[PDB]
Structure formats: structure tokens, C-alpha cells
Design a protein around this ligand. Structure first.
Ligand code: UDP
Ligand code: UDP
Ligand SMILES: OC[C@H]1O[C@](CO)(O[C@H]2O[C@H](CO)[C@@H](O)[C@H](O)[C@H]2O)[C@@H](O)[C@@H]1O
Ligand SMILES: OC[C@H]1O[C@](CO)(O[C@H]2O[C@H](CO)[C@@H](O)[C@H](O)[C@H]2O)[C@@H](O)[C@@H]1O
Lengths: 344, 344
């Protein structure tokens, strides 16, 4: 019953393959409008939404050879958001710190959902707008504390769209999903699959800056027989790619804000053996829906402890803490708190 | 009428500059002069910048040189956030950052004067036409490639000629010169081929950065390991002055729509003609047959070097004083402010 604006990034599509935030903004927007609200999506033009689409570019900036300066369309989008700031009751910004200086100029309250790691550089712009409205996707992400965190909403997925696999494929294999960046540590997943004797079926995208790390540590160890690649899969693939696997290796070497590939694996009914970094303990129920490992050798030992877990429970676990009914209804109270706590 | 509150917004890649510094040098002479005429200037640059106006530092070093910064876009939104939060304290804002400040102008009441320093790429042509009805000041006539914009004026950049020692006849062992970054846009590869057909050695001096590091190690690197081509890249003011002053003719072979190119008027300041390719804003600075030459190919330059000792080298210095003096530039910009302050 409010005028909401969801400012999504332009790198991807509301998303056929890669894209985490755009998937979260989708399940949020596609359900907010269903509850008699009034949302105006701010994303790309190829987006298939059920709200008033307002875009500055039709295609996605990532999969496009004709684009070169993304910061142009980054500033074009915000130029249309805060120009229409009088037509909105609350602005839900997902673009990150690029909207902080614009918030101190308009009148409409703006909420910022954090989606990345705080680095030694971006922590300065957050300290200059510490009292702004923030929303963390995990308690582990809340690292600055000095900011003004409104609440903590766990990212969710449409569980019914993920087909559930009870028993894995008869010839077992491991799994890896996500970008091939050092932030996800696929090189550990390569060794873990080889220290146990179970093949690995990887899947993800390789953008640049990852060109150096990929073809120096990941490409040398591809075979197609024991190590497959499948560069960037869609939804029906990762649905069955993780379903037929015994466990989704998630050996991160980076402060993971959340990790939607963990909750996606478990919907298909697959426990995630990940490193207890970032929001890994906040998602993985130890001994029930995965194993919170603390070393590379801990994952190898946990692999033998994977088949004894209940894969039918892993899906019912996502239906509890990681449901869209929990996430959207938890944002519906965040917007009211921001609107009720304004002037003093 | 002659007591304004100017707001100089400068880039952060280099300080207001030790060696390489294009836009940072123009802002320097413009700031130091306007303060010397009585205006209340407010500079938004780095921290080590040396000015007399009340500067507002957002990071105490040049980001290009400081390696601790991995995201330049962080301090971008910080500087622009501090400018337009104090816009009420200014009479007019002079932006030098580019398209990043266009959506900000459509949010306050202080008029902003945008001085363009870059080419209209296939991407920024979308944002510049969006904020078409604003206040733009070009730096050359050839730089105007949209035409349909709202150009307030065209103020050619200027340098302090008195700070450039005049070398009459150069060094008796003759050599050439190349100034500017070693980018395929400014064409450093063309300068060596002319140095072979003319047979005179070429002494270079520039800057190499990412995205172009592959080009440096490919085309330019296998030709400098010798006395014929002495590199010593990135020279400060007292070093690059003797380089151009001791050069019989500066090689400026460009293959890109140059908006201006301060390296040209710096060569002629110390008394040295420039042989540039007929492209961009080269005919607007170089006078054919008087203080240099304009060529349509590479062999046309080889025939031009044979007609350089006949060129007047003293008239090169007096030509910069004609239309590239700091007193002229600042007077034009000071006259631009009265145009913007009268339209409101
Ligand atoms: O082949 C792939 C690789 C990635 N993804 C999607 O990319 C998102 C990445 O999830 P996550 O948040 O955990 O990784 P990050 O955001 O750090 O890139 C997931 O939702 C996946 O659905 C996908 O669909 N197919
Ligand atoms: O080794 C160098 C190379 C360049 N410059 C300075 O960088 C400026 C060149 O500006 P230009 O417009 O030609 O390059 P751009 O700004 O387009 O990058 C000149 O004033 C030079 O004084 C320098 O000092 N040393
Ligand atoms: O760590 C940088 C990382 O962030 C980007 C965003 O451009 O990737 C994101 O892609 C989508 C949203 O664009 C989300 O899944 C999530 O925010 C990130 O994975 C990219 O620079 C880099 O891969
Ligand atoms: O505004 C960013 C601008 O800087 C880049 C960074 O890669 O490089 C330019 O930096 C100097 C700044 O003085 C420019 O004079 C010069 O054109 C570039 O080397 C450029 O791509 C970005 O557009």
C-alpha cells in the first residue's frame, strides 16, 4: 500500500544465469506488487517484471560487446531515481555505496540493502553516512557496527522452482557453483575432489581480473573426464548439477556476505560443505544441513560424512529461514520502521 | 560583480602536479589566478595539493600513485557528496570531473559550469544528451562532437610560459622528443618509425598504466634497449622542459580525437616546433609552416622534419603567449561565470 522503488544493478537481468542481487530484487519485487503495493522497478529493459519498468538501457551491461563505460548508466539510473524522489514513499537501493551522496539531497527516505564486503576503501564512504538506513543480509556482514543497521534480512530463493533430488546420481560426483574468482576458492575444490577420489563438476563465469588466476590454477587442472567446466549455467542446469552431486563444495577464502549458492544447493536437497567464513555458520546447520569445516583437510573428512545426512531435511530447512514469505514480509516491516522513525 | 565564490572540483588521480598532470594543471593555474584576483575559491582536490584557496581534501594523496586504493569510484562519490552538500555556500560550481556530476546538478539550485576534458565515446554520448540543457565549456572547437548540447563557450587551455626556460638552439647532438602517456590513442609507436626514416634518435618520456601495459611490452619495449632510444619515463617540470627545449622538433603523432593536448603548447613554450598528425584539435593549436606542421601520414612527417630547422624557434614561444596565456584563460572563465549568473 506504498510507493516503493527498487533500484537494481544494471550488470544483469531481473537473471537467466549469473546474478545474485538481481534474483533477490526479483523475488522481492515480484511479490511486493502481488501484495497490493505500488512498485516501480529500476533495472534493465530486458527485465520481465510485473511493475512499472523504468530503465536506462535495454540490455545487460555484462553480456554486451557494445558497452564500455558502465559508470555512465550507473549515474543515468540514479539521475532518474532521485529526480522522481517525490513520487515514492520509500526507495530501496541495491546499487551499493553509489547512492549515499544522493540520499543527503532529497526528502524521501532511502533504504540501502548491503550486498558486498566492506574493504579498507569503501569503509570511508560508509563512515561519512553512518546514520543512514542500512539493511544487512547477515549478522556476520555487520562489521562496522558504527553504522545505523535497521535490521537483518536473510536472502531467500523460490524453493518451489528448485526441483528436489533425493538420491544422487549413481556414479557420484562433487559440485561447485559460482564465479571462478579467488573469493570462492575453486582451487581448493579441485584438490578436495582429488584427495577423495570423486570427480568434480564445476560451473560458473570467468570475467576479467579473474583471467590471470583462472588460466594459471584452474585451467591447467581441467580434463572433462575427472574435472568438467560448463562455463556459466542457467537455472535448469544448476538445479540438476547440484541435485545429482553428493555435496556442494563451497571453500571460500573471502568474507562471504551471504551465499545464495548455498541455499540454492540445499533446496535441490544437497548439503553444503563450506569453510566457516563470513555467513557460512549463519546458513549451514552443522551436522544436519552440511559441515562447517575450518581447513581443506576438514572438507575431505567431511565428504565421507555427507551420505549419512538427510537430503530431504535440507529442503525443509530452506523453507524455514530462507523463504520469500519470510524475506518480503520482513522488508514490509523495515519500510514502516524507516517511515515511522523520520522526524524528531 | 567581481567578488564571486568559485567552487573548483578537480580530479583525484593526480595532485593539483609533479609530472604527469593534464586536467590537474589547468585547474592549478585557474585556481592560483582567481585567488590572486580576489575571488573566494574553494578547491576540492587531494590533500597534498598546494593552493591558497580553502581546499577540501577527501584523500591526502594522488590515487594513481598511492597503491593502497583499489577502487577510485569510492572517493568519487565522497568528493561529489561534499561539493553539492555545500552548494548553497557557493555562487557557481566549476566541475572538471566529467559526466559523474551531471545528475548532481539537477538536484540543487547552484548553477554548475562543466568543463569537458574527454572525448564523446559511444557511451557518454547517452548521458551528455540527457543533461543537454546545462552549462558546458569546451576546450577546443574540434572537441564539440554532439553539437546539439548547450556549450557556454570554448576556452582553450593555457600554461604558465614564464616557468618554462627558453632554449634557443638545442643540443648539438640532435634528437627528437615524445611527451604524453604511452597509449595507442596518442600514438607512441608512430614516433619511432619516423625516428628510423629520419635517422635521428628519439628521446621519450611518458606514463604507462593498466589496460595499456600489454601495448607497452609489445610494440614499444623491443625498441628502447639502446642509446638510440633513451626512455626515462615520466619526467617532472625541470626535466621535461630540457627534453623539449633540447629537441629539434617534438613528435606528436596522434591517432585519436584529441580534445587539446597540453604537451603541444609546452613544447612551443621552450621554443620547439611540433609535427602532429592532422586529427582532433591539432590545427587549432599548431600553425602550419610557422610553429610546426600538420601531416596526413607518416612519410609526410619525415619530409616535415627536413623542413624544421627553417622554422622560427623564438616565434614558437611568443605564439603561446598570444592565445595560450593564463591571463587569457582565467579571463574567459571569469567571463563565463557572468554568463551563467545572469541567466538565473
Ligand atoms: O552457473 C551459474 C553460476 C552462478 N549462478 C547464479 O549466480 C548467483 C551467485 O550466488 P552467490 O550470491 O552465492 O555468489 P556471489 O553473489 O558472491 O557472486 C547464484 O544465485 C546463482 O543462481 C547461476 O545461476 N549459474
Ligand atoms: O612525462 C610526462 C608526460 C606528461 N606530462 C604532463 O601531462 C600533460 C599532458 O596532458 P595531455 O592533455 O596532453 O594528456 P591527457 O590529459 O589527454 O591525458 C602535460 O601538461 C605534461 O606536462 C608530464 O609532465 N610528463
Ligand atoms: O566482488 C565484485 C563482484 O560484484 C559483482 C558486481 O559487479 O558481481 C556481482 O554480481 C551480482 C550483481 O551484479 C551479484 O551476484 C553479486 O552482487 C555479485 O556477484 C562483480 O563486480 C564482481 O564479480
Ligand atoms: O575519470 C577517470 C578517467 O581516468 C582514466 C582512468 O582510466 O584515465 C585518465 O586519467 C587522466 C586524468 O587526468 C586523463 O587525463 C587521461 O585521459 C586518462 O589517462 C580514464 O579511463 C577515465 O575516463
Amino acid at each position: 500500500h506504498m510507493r516503493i522503488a527498487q533500484v537494481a544493478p544494471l550488470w544483469e537481468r531481473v537473471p537467466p544465469a549469473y546474478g545474485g542481487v538481481e534474483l533477490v530484487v526479483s523475488l522481492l519485487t515480484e511479490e511486493l506488487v502481488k501484495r497490493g503495493h505500488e512498485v516501480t522497478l529500476f533495472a534493465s529493459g530486458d527485465s520481465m517484471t510485473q511493475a512499472k519498468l523504468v530503465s536506462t538501457y535495454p540490455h545487460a551491461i555484462r553480456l554486451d560487446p557494445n558497452v564500455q563505460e558502465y559508470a555512465v548508466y550507473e549515474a543515468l539510473q540514479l539521475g532518474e531515481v532521485f529526480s522522481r524522489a517525490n513520487e515514492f514513499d520509500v526507495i530501496h537501493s541495491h546499487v551499493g555505496y553509489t547512492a549515499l551522496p544522493y540520499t543527503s539531497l532529497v526528502k524521501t527516505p532511502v533504504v540501502h540493502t548491503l550486498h558486498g564486503r566492506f574493504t579498507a576503501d569503501n569503509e570511508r564512504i560508509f563512515s561519512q553516512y553512518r546514520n543512514q538506513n542500512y539493511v544487512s543480509i547477515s549478522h556476520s556482514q555487520r562489521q562496522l557496527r558504527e553504522l545505523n543497521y535497521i535490521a537483518t534480512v536473510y536472502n531467500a530463493i523460490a524453493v518451489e522452482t528448485h526441483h528436489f533430488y533425493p538420491q544422487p546420481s549413481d556414479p557420484p560426483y562433487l559440485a561447485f557453483l559460482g564465479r571462478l574468482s579467488p573469493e570462492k576458492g575453486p582451487h581448493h575444490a579441485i584438490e578436495i575432489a582429488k584427495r577423495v577420489g570423486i570427480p568434480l563438476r564445476m560451473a560458473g563465469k570467468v570475467d576479467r581480473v579473474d583471467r590471470d588466476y583462472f588460466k594459471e590454477l584452474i585451467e591447467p587442472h581441467i580434463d572433462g573426464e575427472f574435472i568438467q567446466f560448463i562455463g556459466e549455467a542457467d537455472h535448469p542446469t544448476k538445479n540438476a548439477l547440484l541435485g545429482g552431486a553428493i555435496a556442494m563444495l563451497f571453500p571460500i577464502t573471502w568474507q562471504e556476505p551471504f551465499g545464495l549458492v548455498m541455499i540454492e544447493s540445499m533446496a535441490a536437497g544437497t548439503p553444503v560443505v563450506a569453510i566457516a567464513k563470513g555467513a557460512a555458520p549463519e546458513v549451514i546447520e552443522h551436522g544436519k544441513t552440511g559441515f562447517l569445516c575450518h581447513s581443506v583437510e576438514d572438507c575431505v573428512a567431511a565428504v565421507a560424512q555427507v551420505p549419512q545426512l538427510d537430503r530431504m531435511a535440507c529442503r525443509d530447512y530452506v523453507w524455514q529461514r530462507f523463504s520469500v514469505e519470510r524475506m518480503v514480509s520482513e522488508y514490509e516491516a523495515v519500510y514502516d520502521t524507516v517511515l515511522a522513525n523520520t522526524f524528531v
